[PDB]
């Protein structure tokens, strides 16, 4: 799971992405965020589309 925090629980229906992460041994995938149970890493302002965070409504 990329990003800080996660409403990811236990019986969470979630979308894998693919792309082995270097550190954790034998973890070859990702959870793409902003689909099904996994949600947008909250209040990321920068690299957003990669974390499924919808554009913040500027005042």
């Amino acid at each position: 799971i990329p990003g800080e925090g996660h409403n990811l629980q236990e019986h969470s229906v979630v979308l894998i992405r693919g792309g082995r992460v270097k550190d954790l041994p034998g973890v070859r995938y990702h959870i793409v965020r902003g689909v099904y149970d996994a949600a947008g890493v909250k209040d990321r302002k920068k690299s957003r589309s990669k974390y499924g965070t919808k554009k913040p409504k500027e005042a």
Partner: protein, 71 residues
């Protein structure tokens, strides 16, 4: 976001696993394989069983602690 969440509870060093990982039994109870802190590693601060150490513990998995302070 960086969440302030961790529990700064102390514990007895039960047993040394590899890397610098320890099954340390806390003040309150459960023994968790607790890995040493990075800071500690940097300042070469050894630990042996029979110690009382500060162990920062996660909300996500209260099973993997982190030995923060030099005893």
């Amino acid at each position: 976001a960086k969440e302030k969440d961790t529990i700064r509870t102390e514990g007895v060093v039960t047993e040394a696993l590899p890397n610098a990982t320890f099954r340390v039994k806390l003040d309150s109870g459960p023994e968790i394989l607790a890995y040493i802190s990075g800071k500690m590693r940097m300042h070469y601060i050894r630990i042996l069983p029979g110690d009382r150490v500060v162990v920062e513990i996660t909300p996500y998995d209260p099973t993997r602690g982190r030995i923060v302070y030099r005893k």
